[PDB]
Amino acid sequence: FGTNGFDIPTIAIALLIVGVIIGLSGLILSIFATATASAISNPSPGTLAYNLTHPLINGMVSFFSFFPTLYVLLGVTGIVLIAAGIISIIMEKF
Amino acid sequence: FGTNGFDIPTIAIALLIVGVIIGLSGLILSIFATATASAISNPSPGTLAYNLTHPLINGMVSFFSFFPTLYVLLGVTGIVLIAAGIISIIMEKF
Amino acid sequence: FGTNGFDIPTIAIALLIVGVIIGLSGLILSIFATATASAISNPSPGTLAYNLTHPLINGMVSFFSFFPTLYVLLGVTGIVLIAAGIISIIMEKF
Amino acid sequence: FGTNGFDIPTIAIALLIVGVIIGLSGLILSIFATATASAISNPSPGTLAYNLTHPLINGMVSFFSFFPTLYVLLGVTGIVLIAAGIISIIMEKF
Amino acid sequence: FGTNGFDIPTIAIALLIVGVIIGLSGLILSIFATATASAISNPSPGTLAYNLTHPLINGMVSFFSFFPTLYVLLGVTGIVLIAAGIISIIMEKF
Amino acid sequence: FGTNGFDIPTIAIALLIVGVIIGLSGLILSIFATATASAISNPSPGTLAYNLTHPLINGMVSFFSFFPTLYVLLGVTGIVLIAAGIISIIMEKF
Amino acid sequence: FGTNGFDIPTIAIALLIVGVIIGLSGLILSIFATATASAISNPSPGTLAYNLTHPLINGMVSFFSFFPTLYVLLGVTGIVLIAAGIISIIMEKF
Structure with a gap:
């Protein structure tokens, strides 16, 4: 179900994979x-x-606060991919 | 039942597949x-x-809120495919 | 799920790895x-x-105060990578 | 009763085995x-x-509290297997 | 009684087998x-x-509550097989 | 019951072994x-x-206080293994 | 009366033997x-x-309380054997 490499089943399976991994x-x-x-005490x-x-735990806190935006961008990527597919x-379908 | 690669049975089977996978x-x-x-406690x-x-669960929530629009676009794709087929x-049928 | 080497599952696994290592x-x-x-007494x-x-413990303190910014830069790197992927x-997706 | 390696009798026997072992x-x-x-007194x-x-019994308690989620994941695995089979x-049945 | 590998007697025998095993x-x-x-006391x-x-019996309860949906999916599989046969x-019968 | 080396019965038996040994x-x-x-008096x-x-008993106390986190990490390892299996x-099941 | 090694007379004789021995x-x-x-006084x-x-008689009591579940498992084994035979x-009878 597609044209060259865009397969809706493949996309759904991929989404499956990213969700479970996350x-x-x-x-x-x-x-x-x-x-x-x-x-740690x-x-x-x-x-x-x-x-x-103290600086070690500070670095811990910093990196973990960096995580959320990483996740947000990762999520954004999929909309771009599906759009390019559409x-x-x-x-060339017409 | 078709012209070149547009087969209504094939389309129905494909819809079958995407629905069950989802x-x-x-x-x-x-x-x-x-x-x-x-x-998690x-x-x-x-x-x-x-x-x-805390930031980890925040990223979880964000990504899972990103899922719905992904699904909506995936659903939209099929109407485009069927239209191109029509x-x-x-x-060239006439 | 990607084009050449950008794979969202791969990215998630890599983030996994850096987080646990840190x-x-x-x-x-x-x-x-x-x-x-x-x-030490x-x-x-x-x-x-x-x-x-005394100078030894001073050097200890200095280096450990240097750690945090190292961690911050390391965290920043991932946003750059995801952006380049996007x-x-x-x-060439279009 | 299957296509290549998916055999419903085999699956039932396997479930038998895991249940009795657990x-x-x-x-x-x-x-x-x-x-x-x-x-111990x-x-x-x-x-x-x-x-x-005291720390020994603490470690005992910790590990045994870790068991339940292990079991839950082990149970989850079977649904994935049956789904992949379906x-x-x-x-290729059609 | 069939075309290539779809044999109604074979199917009935297979159903026999799964039912008795279950x-x-x-x-x-x-x-x-x-x-x-x-x-256990x-x-x-x-x-x-x-x-x-306590956690052990909790894991027991969890897994055994996981069983029912496994059985339901296993049952669903047969309808799919018979449908593919039909x-x-x-x-190619016509 | 598995694909290459991931066998749910094998996993359950292994968990058996670690629990009894601990x-x-x-x-x-x-x-x-x-x-x-x-x-000792x-x-x-x-x-x-x-x-x-006195220092000997101090070292005893220290090491035995180190045990618990060792056990905690050992317990954590199994979740990682089961996840990798999933x-x-x-x-490649799909 | 059987196929390879499953003989109902043999099974009955075996049950005879276990019952009388018990x-x-x-x-x-x-x-x-x-x-x-x-x-003992x-x-x-x-x-x-x-x-x-006193501890000797305590061990006596413990072991003899362990006997019943041993017997129960021994009894359970026969149902498994007969099932495998069926x-x-x-x-391959069909």
């Missing part, structure tokens, strides 16, 4: 992050270990 | 998402794990 | 730094050992 | 865990043996 | 589950054995 | 640690034997 | 246990012999 990503990362939170506000450890169909 | 997609994703929801509003985990029939 | 980095470094903090403010040891799709 | 797993683990609970809240033993039948 | 599955699993229920709501054992007959 | 580990270590606690807070013995099934 | 087991064990009960609740002897008959 669900698993969220699952694994949340579970692992829970363990991370459990492991809070030594003191101003002792040596604080100086040694236009390619229209161009 | 039903299965919804089924699997809903079932898996239920497990995801069960797995709500630690606290402001502790370390919250900072570590026009191609008309062009 | 979580483990934070975990290991925090745990090891706790041991470092435990090991505070001899005195002005004796020989102080002269011998543009490459658009260029 | 029942036996629950049986054996529960019985053994009862013996474990009987064996509660020395005191703060003596040496408490320091020596789709494979449909693809 | 009946036996239900029989064996119910009988074994009765023994499982008899074996209820120690206490909050003691060590409870922590040690269509294949019609295609 | 239960036995907890059992043996707790029993042995009880004997350790019984054997508390000489005095400041005599020679105290200087000679994705591998999905990739 | 009856004799119960007989001998009950008779011997009566003698055991007669032999009850010295006192707290004297030396009590410390020396299915094997059906498979």
Whole structure:
């Protein structure tokens, strides 16, 4: 069901794949992050270990705040692909 | 039953395929998402794990809100295909 | 699901990998730094050992303060990659 | 009764096997865990043996709380397999 | 009685086989589950054995609740097979 | 019941094995640690034997506090394995 | 009366054998246990012999409470065997 490489079943299967992979990503990362939170302690506000450890957790927080927009762009990509498929169909189907 | 590659039985079979695949997609994703929801807990509003985990679930929500329009476009594609078939029939059938 | 090398599943898997690796980095470094903090003592403010040891801990502090911006840039890189993928799709998909 | 490797009798037999194995797993683990609970005592809240033993039982509890989601995913897998079988039948049966 | 591989007697025999296998599955699993229920006891709501054992029975319950939809899909498969047979007959019988 | 090496019965048997081994580990270590606690005495807070013995018990305590996170990671590993199996099934089952 | 190794007379004879052996087991064990009960006395609740002897009778009680489920599983096995025989008959008898 298509013209050259645009196959609606193929597209649906691909969407299947990305959705399940993303669900698993969220699952694994949340579970692992829970363990991370459990492991690290809070030594003191101003002792040596604080100086040694604080920037690391800051970098953690930063990267994880970067994740959402990555996901948003990844989602946006599919609309572009489906649109290109539609236009390619229209161009030479007539 | 057609002219070159437009076969009404073929079209019906293809519609069959996309419909069943989409039903299965919804089924699997809903079932898996239920497990995801069960797995992740709500630690606290402001502790370390919250900072570590909140953006992930935000990205989850965003992508899943992106799904519907993808499905709508996928559905729209078939009307275009059937239309092109009709026009191609008309062009050289007379 | 892509054109030449841009595969949304591949991208999601890669994000998976970087996230888990970074979580483990934070975990290991925090745990090891706790041991470092435990090991070194505070001899005195002005004796020989102080002269011998203070610059080392200063260098420690400096490098660990350098980490966060490294992480921020690493996070920024992915948006660039996804953007290039989008543009490459658009260029020849039409 | 099938096309290439999808055999409904084979599937039913496989389900048989997983179900009985899982029942036996629950049986054996529960019985053994009862013996474990009987064996270990509660020395005191703060003596040496408490320091020596508490983290072990904590790890026990953690792993056993990890079991349920493992089982849930294992169960989910079969729906995926049956779905793939259905789709494979449909693809070339017509 | 057929064209290439679609034989109504063969189909009836296959249905025979799946039905009897499924009946036996239900029989064996119910009988074994009765023994499982008899074996495991209820120690206490909050003691060590409870922590040690509860997630296992939870996983049991989950998987067994997953069974029904597996059976439903397995049943659905046969209608698809018979339909494909009918269509294949019609295609080249005329 | 699988595609290449992913076998649900095999997975269940493996889970069986890890669970029983971990239960036995907890059992043996707790029993042995009880004997350790019984054997060592508390000489005095400041005599020679105290200087000679205290760091050893400190190292004991440290390592045993390290155990729990080891167990947590070990548990996390299985979810990853089952996920990879699911994705591998999905990739070429369609 | 069978196909390859499934012989209803053979099965009946085997059932004969297991039943009589189990009856004799119960007989001998009950008779011997009566003698055991007669032999051992009850010295006192707290004297030396009590410390020396109580765990032994506890182990006796435990093992004998383990017997019933062993018997139940042994009984379950025969239904499985007869079922496999039925299915094997059906498979190639047609």
